Amino acid sequence: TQLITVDEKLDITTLTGVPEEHIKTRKVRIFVPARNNMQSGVNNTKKWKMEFDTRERWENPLMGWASTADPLSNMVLTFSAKEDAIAFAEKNGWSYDVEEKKVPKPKSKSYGANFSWNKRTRVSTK
Amino acid sequence: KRPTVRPRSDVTHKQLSAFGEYVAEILPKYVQQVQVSCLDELEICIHPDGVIPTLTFLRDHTNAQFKSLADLTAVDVPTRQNRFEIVYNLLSLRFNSRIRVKTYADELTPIDSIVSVHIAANWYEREVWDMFGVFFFNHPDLRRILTDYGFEGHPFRKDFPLTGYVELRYDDEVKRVVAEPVELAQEFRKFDLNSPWEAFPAYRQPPE
Amino acid sequence: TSVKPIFSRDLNEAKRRVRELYRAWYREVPNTVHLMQLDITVKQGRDKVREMFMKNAHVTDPRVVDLLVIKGKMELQETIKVWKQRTHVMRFFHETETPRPKDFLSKFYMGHDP
Amino acid sequence: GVQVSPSGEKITHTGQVYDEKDYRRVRFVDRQKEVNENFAIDLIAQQPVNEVEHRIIACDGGGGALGHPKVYINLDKETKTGTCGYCGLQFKQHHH
Amino acid sequence: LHHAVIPHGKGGRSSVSGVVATVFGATGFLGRYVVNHLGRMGSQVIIPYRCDVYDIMHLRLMGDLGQLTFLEWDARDKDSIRKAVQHSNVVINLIGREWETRNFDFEDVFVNIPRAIAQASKEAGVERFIHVSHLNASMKSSSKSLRSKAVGEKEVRSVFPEAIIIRPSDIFGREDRFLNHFANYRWFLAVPLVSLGFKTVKQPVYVADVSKGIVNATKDPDAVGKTFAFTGPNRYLLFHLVKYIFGMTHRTFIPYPLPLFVYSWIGKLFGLSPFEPWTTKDKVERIHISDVMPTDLPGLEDLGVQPTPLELKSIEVLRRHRTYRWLSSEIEETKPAKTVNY
Amino acid sequence: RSRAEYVVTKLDDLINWARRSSLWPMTFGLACCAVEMMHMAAPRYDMDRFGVVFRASPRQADVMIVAGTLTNKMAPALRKVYDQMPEPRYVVSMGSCANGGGYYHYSYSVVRGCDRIVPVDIYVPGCPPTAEALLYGILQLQRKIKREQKLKIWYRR
Amino acid sequence: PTTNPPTARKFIWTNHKFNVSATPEQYVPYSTTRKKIHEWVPPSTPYK
Amino acid sequence: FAYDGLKRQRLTEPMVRNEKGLLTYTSWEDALSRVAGMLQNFEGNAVAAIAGGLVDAEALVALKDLLNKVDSDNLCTEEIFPTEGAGTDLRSNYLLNTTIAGVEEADVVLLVGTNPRFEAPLFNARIRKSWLHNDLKVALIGSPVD
Amino acid sequence: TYKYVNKKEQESEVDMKSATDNAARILMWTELIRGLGMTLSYLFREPATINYPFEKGPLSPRFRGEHALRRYPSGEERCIACKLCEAICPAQAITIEAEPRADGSRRTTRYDIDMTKCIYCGFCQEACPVDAIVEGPNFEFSTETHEELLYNKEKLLNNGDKWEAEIAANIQADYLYR
Numbered sequence A: 001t002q003l004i005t006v007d008e009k010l011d012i013t014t015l016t017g018v019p020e021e022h023i024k025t026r027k028v029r030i031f032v033p034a035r036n037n038m039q040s041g042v043n044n045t046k047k048w049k050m051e052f053d054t055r056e057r058w059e060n061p062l063m064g065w066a067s068t069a070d071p072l073s074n075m076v077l078t079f080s081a082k083e084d085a086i087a088f089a090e091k092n093g094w095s096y097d098v099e100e101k102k103v104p105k106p107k108s109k110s111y112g113a114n115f116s117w118n119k120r121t122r123v124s125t126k
Numbered sequence B: 001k002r003p004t005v006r007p008r009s010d011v012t013h014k015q016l017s018a019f020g021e022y023v024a025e026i027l028p029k030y031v032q033q034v035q036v037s038c039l040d041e042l043e044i045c046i047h048p049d050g051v052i053p054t055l056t057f058l059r060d061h062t063n064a065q066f067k068s069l070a071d072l073t074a075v076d077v078p079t080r081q082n083r084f085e086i087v088y089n090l091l092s093l094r095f096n097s098r099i100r101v102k103t104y105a106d107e108l109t110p111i112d113s114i115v116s117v118h119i120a121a122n123w124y125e126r127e128v129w130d131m132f133g134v135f136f137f138n139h140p141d142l143r144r145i146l147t148d149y150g151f152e153g154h155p156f157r158k159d160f161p162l163t164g165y166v167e168l169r170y171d172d173e174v175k176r177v178v179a180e181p182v183e184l185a186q187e188f189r190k191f192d193l194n195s196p197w198e199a200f201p202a203y204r205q206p207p208e
Numbered sequence C: 001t002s003v004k005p006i007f008s009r010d011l012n013e014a015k016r017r018v019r020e021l022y023r024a025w026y027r028e029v030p031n032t033v034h035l036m037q038l039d040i041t042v043k044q045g046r047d048k049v050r051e052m053f054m055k056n057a058h059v060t061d062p063r064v065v066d067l068l069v070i071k072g073k074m075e076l077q078e079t080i081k082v083w084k085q086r087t088h089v090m091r092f093f094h095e096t097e098t099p100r101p102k103d104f105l106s107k108f109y110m111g112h113d114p
Numbered sequence D: 001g002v003q004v005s006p007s008g009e010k011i012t013h014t015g016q017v018y019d020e021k022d023y024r025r026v027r028f029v030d031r032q033k034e035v036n037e038n039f040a041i042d043l044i045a046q047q048p049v050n051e052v053e054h055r056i057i058a059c060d061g062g063g064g065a066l067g068h069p070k071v072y073i074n075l076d077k078e079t080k081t082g083t084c085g086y087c088g089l090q091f092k093q094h095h096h
Numbered sequence E: 001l002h003h004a005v006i007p008h009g010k011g012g013r014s015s016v017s018g019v020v021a022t023v024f025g026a027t028g029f030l031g032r033y034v035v036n037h038l039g040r041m042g043s044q045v046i047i048p049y050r051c052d053v054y055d056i057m058h059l060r061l062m063g064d065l066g067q068l069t070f071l072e073w074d075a076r077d078k079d080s081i082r083k084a085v086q087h088s089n090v091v092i093n094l095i096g097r098e099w100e101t102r103n104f105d106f107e108d109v110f111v112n113i114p115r116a117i118a119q120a121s122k123e124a125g126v127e128r129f130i131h132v133s134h135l136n137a138s139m140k141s142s143s144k145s146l147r148s149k150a151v152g153e154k155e156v157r158s159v160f161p162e163a164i165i166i167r168p169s170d171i172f173g174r175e176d177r178f179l180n181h182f183a184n185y186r187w188f189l190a191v192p193l194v195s196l197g198f199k200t201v202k203q204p205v206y207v208a209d210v211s212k213g214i215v216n217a218t219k220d221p222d223a224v225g226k227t228f229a230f231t232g233p234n235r236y237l238l239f240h241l242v243k244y245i246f247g248m249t250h251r252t253f254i255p256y257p258l259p260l261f262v263y264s265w266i267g268k269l270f271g272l273s274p275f276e277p278w279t280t281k282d283k284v285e286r287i288h289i290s291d292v293m294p295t296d297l298p299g300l301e302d303l304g305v306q307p308t309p310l311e312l313k314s315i316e317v318l319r320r321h322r323t324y325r326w327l328s329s330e331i332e333e334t335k336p337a338k339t340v341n342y
Numbered sequence F: 001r002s003r004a005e006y007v008v009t010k011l012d013d014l015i016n017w018a019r020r021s022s023l024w025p026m027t028f029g030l031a032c033c034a035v036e037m038m039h040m041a042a043p044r045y046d047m048d049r050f051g052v053v054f055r056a057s058p059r060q061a062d063v064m065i066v067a068g069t070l071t072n073k074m075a076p077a078l079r080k081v082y083d084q085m086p087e088p089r090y091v092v093s094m095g096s097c098a099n100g101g102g103y104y105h106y107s108y109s110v111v112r113g114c115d116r117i118v119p120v121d122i123y124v125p126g127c128p129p130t131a132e133a134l135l136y137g138i139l140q141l142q143r144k145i146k147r148e149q150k151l152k153i154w155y156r157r
Numbered sequence G: 001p002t003t004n005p006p007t008a009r010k011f012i013w014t015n016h017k018f019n020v021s022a023t024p025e026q027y028v029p030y031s032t033t034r035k036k037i038h039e040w041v042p043p044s045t046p047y048k
Numbered sequence H: 001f002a003y004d005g006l007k008r009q010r011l012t013e014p015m016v017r018n019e020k021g022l023l024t025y026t027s028w029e030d031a032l033s034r035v036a037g038m039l040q041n042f043e044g045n046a047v048a049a050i051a052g053g054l055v056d057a058e059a060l061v062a063l064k065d066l067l068n069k070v071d072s073d074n075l076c077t078e079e080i081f082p083t084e085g086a087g088t089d090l091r092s093n094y095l096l097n098t099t100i101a102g103v104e105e106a107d108v109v110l111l112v113g114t115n116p117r118f119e120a121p122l123f124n125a126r127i128r129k130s131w132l133h134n135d136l137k138v139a140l141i142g143s144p145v146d
Numbered sequence I: 001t002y003k004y005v006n007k008k009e010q011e012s013e014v015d016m017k018s019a020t021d022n023a024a025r026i027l028m029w030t031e032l033i034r035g036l037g038m039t040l041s042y043l044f045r046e047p048a049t050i051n052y053p054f055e056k057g058p059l060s061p062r063f064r065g066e067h068a069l070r071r072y073p074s075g076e077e078r079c080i081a082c083k084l085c086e087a088i089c090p091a092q093a094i095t096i097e098a099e100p101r102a103d104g105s106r107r108t109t110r111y112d113i114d115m116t117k118c119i120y121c122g123f124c125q126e127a128c129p130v131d132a133i134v135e136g137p138n139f140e141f142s143t144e145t146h147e148e149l150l151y152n153k154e155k156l157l158n159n160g161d162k163w164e165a166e167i168a169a170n171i172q173a174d175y176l177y178r
Ligand SMILES: CCCCCCCCCCCCCCCCCC(=O)OC[C@H](COP(=O)([O-])OCC[N+](C)(C)C)OC(=O)CCCCCCCCCCCCCCCCC
Pocket: I026, I027, I028, I029, I032, I033
């Protein structure tokens, strides 16, 4: 008596208040952000993110600042799981492109390979 | 002893844990979680349908007497199914204590308003509806309280942009203040201020 | 695939609520045009109400259309009691906004925005 | 020092100036475009080279805590003086 | 083109529409609307002004920061005209008076100033010049202003050969001198029309429509060297037009057939004033000159503007002139005036 | 020059002296900056000594001191009370919020500067600008409306 | 600053300027950054 | 470090030849009108396209559909690959079928007619990594190149 | 502890003298007369009004006024284009771009401060490692247009050249606290 049945895709775009252009014409990207190679820390590659497609930024006539016309340029949303990001994107009606998480491949490391009798992995300097 | 470390007391933690056990065993129908923080603060997380019995028990019980509602708010965590975590902060002047009651909701499941328990919940739930879009059942006058008249969207949600969608400017052709789509002379520069080295090993999550 | 209803068990009761809200808006539009000194006529306001309803016409979830009825009722009350002004009413018409054309040649000639 | 373009508009120390056909000079019509007359590039070109005796010199820009973070300059290359990265003061070791 | 004149943005307040427009009659009635449209789409608008900074200061919010450049000019200063039109690609000429002062007459205002502006613009190298004359300014008209505007059209075309000549009809708007004038007849006993207001046909055009037409002429590639006619959708007799104006005002209506020569006498009687006159002999001649039919000339349709009707845009002008009794009256409470095909 | 130009200039100087010697603000403030404008009304600075007296109704007001944040819910009221002032009306913007949005420039509910709504005559910077700075702005407005020549431009017309 | 004058520098103004707003001497903002993207210039010689 | 080439010698506006023979800037409408008029003037064999190196697949398929609609099959690339035999018909004929994982997995590699160090620096780096770790036998037909 | 502000202790009973005193208080308006007398005392005091602009309100060396870019005693600009002030600026009122200079130093080609967006909080002057950006105590810089309140690098350096006489003195007087 307090449970009804729906068989739909949970569309809330009419309740979000977003204009039609920023719903239909937008493409979001769902991915784990790549580790920047200037550092070795990997704490930033643990939460999934969706960002939006980049729109036009031009130069201000007066000062030369980076003027924009879109609202969803600084919009970054963080998620614990990829399927949670899919649920949020399909609920808000945005078409999504999803990149699978690029985990680093395990590799064999041995300090004694630097001092090999016959293999080419012997190093000439330290 | 340590001048740069905040002193801690275990007596308040023990009393709040005992009262958490007390409330959890009095109300097993709704209480889903009871936790006491390191800062000596008690939180009870409950089912959404038990907000009226939980608040009524905490206000009108002799051993609770939480007669003052400190605040009512919501937190938008858009990675869980019920994204709006609704928080009631309550004060007990008789026992000089503070308690936090948490519940959950999403964009299409309203919860019961507690205006019949606390009158400040009227304006606080109006603020919650205006900012997050959480509907409240049996509210006397649920409407917007902080946004502009005719404002579309709930701005304290995560997915809402910081600058919004429209701005106001005066047009002399129609002699009116009119709304236009957002254009900024200088765009808000997003800063990635997050170090890729782990800061707190006590909160290290297990890998996925 | 089973959820909890807000007000209507199925789409028919919510459609009844939509019809009642449309009745109230259609009744209010002449009073709004008379009370606030609006440029529009009675026909333009009723056409705008019809346009908004047909804009929201694609919804088939009872909870979503119940919340849409709730939002429309708050807008209606905010129109009954004079809190929206002439500017707030005329924001529905976008008479200062030049509309972007829907054709590819115009989208190509203006800028890079699709 | 300040120099003027063929359009008659003076050039800043960054080196930027509007073109002859640039429409943005109507911003300066009936007004003035101000340029700081003291250029840091030639104001260092008038600074003398600090002649010291040590192989490693320490610079804080003068004034102690009123200057910059103190750095250490290695004066080994005899063909080029050592310049402080903050204040731009040149230092030279003595080979006599 | 130049790198800084390339359009950018989505056409909003902070966008770049890529037009540098020097608007000369920007202080007056049509000038505020054309500057509003230019700053709305986002443009480099130069306003050369003659009057007080307080009098032009209503134009200060029409555009973004630094997109509006106000500068002094004198109508007798070719140097100042050239310095106003030096950095521009569109020069818009809206200079005009409805009367004659002791410093500037109709010939100077409608010939000498537009010729000097066009000459400075051609010698400065702009690529678009738009000049607003009046409709039915062919030649040998019964009023001095129409003849002066016709010979000014001749001089402007002789100096600047590809100038876009825009001929609008009697423009109506919130701050016009047409609908407010006919509602200002209510302060007297009757409405003194010539031949009871008949044999005089008018098609007024909305000021926003004229301004949109001027802006689309700035961005129209095939409008160069053309003469446009900016007319309203419906032609009304003068009697029925004044009847509709007073019906919308809800004041009263008593017409009076008064002969044209003594009406010109009382017109110049009102015009002999040191301040802005209520009416002049030239004003009443322009009122009783009938509007011609634009057959071969292109118009607002060909320039991209749908002409908004006077019946639709009349209540934003005449609600000022009604009393408290009829203040809350809608469009449908006043019968629209009968149109004429001729 | 001729005799009439000097007479017009001296009359116009008298007109402007009266206009700048009697300027009345509308009793209207928004925020922090309104606390500072009543600190300028406070006895240390004495805007009443300078000749500057609050009148609550815009019909008796001359200068409009927009002192604080202009929100989207407040902008129509701001424009209404600006338009209801009589014809010689001047506007001083006070603080970073009224100048260019200030500390809420990137907000969904804040008008990015009150010059988008009302024509601002002068701008006073600061957050808040001190009562010293607002008194400086008021004196600058007095000098600015001393500078104008309405009668002289009318005679040159 | 008669018994304790400030330190003399050769970049400090010898002559002070007051508030020069609403004068031809007033400050006018501009971009201090040069052009970034340079257009390809076509040659001035026809192919045929 | 070659990203700063995207700041110089750039095409920003459409250009057309003059009546005297010089390239001058014009509008998109005029440029597309002239190209479209010439395209409607000329027939299928008379129109051809050639593609360079920094071209995405979207423009390639768009130009392919356009020239196929005007019945043109001369869709050439400035890079030469053999056409007879299998040619481009079979995807194994023009592809690094072993891939870079197969570079790591192989034990003898034979480079014929290439300078991988400059033609594909990361592929050559993977060759060197597998040569250092798994002891590849690398051989070369070509000029003696470091 | 606590105290009562309006609760009187017990009752003062009814006495003939007390009734006469209350009657005199109600009839002859005694508290009104003493309020008049106190306002008369203020009338005969000395006003606290300073004679602006000839007398200025007192300030402190820490005062945050108009922004300025300082130089070294050699005359070289102190800023090294490190963008720390732009990072710390809460209102995002600082825009910086830079490149290596002709001699290889890292100097700003663009240091703009939107002073209509500035909140005048001193975070930039307490975050600058070389004391380049400061808040000189000039507050008398109100303008007539919104544009000329948007400061660029040339205006900021020119203002630092103008106000260097008291900026260095104020930093000398106050720098030992910071
Ligand atoms: C013109 C000459 C100078 C006049 C005085 C000018 C200077 C002083 C001005 C003072 C400031 C006034 C400002 C406005 C104040 C308004 C409030 C106010 O006054 O309220 C009135 C107050 C009101 O008192 P109340 O309001 O506190 O009382 C409570 C009343 N209820 C409960 C109803 C609210 O006092 C009066 O009404 C008293 C009026 C004067 C009575 C004078 C009586 C004199 C003695 C008569 C004879 C007695 C002996 C008879 C014979 C016996 C024989 C045995």
